[PDB]
């Protein structure tokens, strides 16, 4: 059975919510150099930051003190991922770890901010009304603040 | 700083295994290794219950949702204990000590659940027949898929 060596701390399971940090990976692709796979992994980890944000937005929407009036489905939450991702700013690649067994490339990233006006417009463009958008964007703003 | 002899199950990427859970307890002077493992194992088991709650929340928010009752995030959080209590045949599959943080991690897998116990627990927290029956069905589907 299988154990891994030289594993950085951020690769490990842990209880700790760095909502604006993302860890994710890319598998290898024949004909793509490892550096290319690191780029893909870094983008995937950045999408993961957006996924982390959407998760917090669903919980807020489900809360007894939700103020969003529009009905927002799970599928709509999933759709929010792209506009949130598109709005992320100043995202730093903090680390790379490669699993030598399958050569899967993991990236650690941190998004230092987001563009509230870009996020607003993206959310409008997926048919969320202005009351819903205002609350959603304010929530994302709190997440960056609290981070 | 780097960690050595890290088992696969300790990596960050295990969301797909809804019925598996990992969590830890801190090594403290005055506690026996066995009390510490027991706490980590309990916590790992609570993580399985939380994994299940998250799937229920997603199913409830889906456009396909047929549960008519209003269920709040706080109510979903409240479902964690009845789900935990209903878990059956929860096997401890590993222990890992992190020497950097002095944390003992446990890996568990729940092989199943008691749908009657879960029902009774959900009924006690004021979920209606329709909600309980559907939530229970969804948990059954999670275990079937596992
Ligand atoms: Ni418009």
UniProtKB/TrEMBL annotation, chain A:
The chain holds residues 34 to 180 of 192 of the full protein. This is Tumor necrosis factor alpha-inducing protein.
């Amino acid at each position: 059975n299988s154990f891994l060596q030289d594993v950085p701390y951020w690769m490990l399971q842990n209880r700790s919510e760095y909502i604006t940090q993302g860890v994710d990976s890319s598998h290898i692709v024949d004909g793509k150099k490892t550096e290319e796979i690191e780029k893909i992994a870094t983008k995937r980890a950045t999408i993961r930051v957006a996924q982390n944000i959407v998760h917090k937005l669903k919980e807020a929407y489900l809360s007894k003190t939700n103020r969003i009036k529009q009905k927002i489905t799970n599928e709509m939450f999933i759709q929010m991922t792209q506009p949130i991702y598109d709005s992320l700013m100043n995202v730093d690649r903090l680390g790379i770890y490669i699993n030598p067994n399958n050569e899967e490339v993991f990236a650690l990233v941190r998004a230092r901010g987001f563009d509230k006006d870009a996020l607003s417009e993206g959310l409008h463009k997926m048919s969320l009304d202005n009351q819903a958008v205002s609350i959603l964007v304010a929530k994302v703003e709190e997440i960056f603040k609290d981070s």
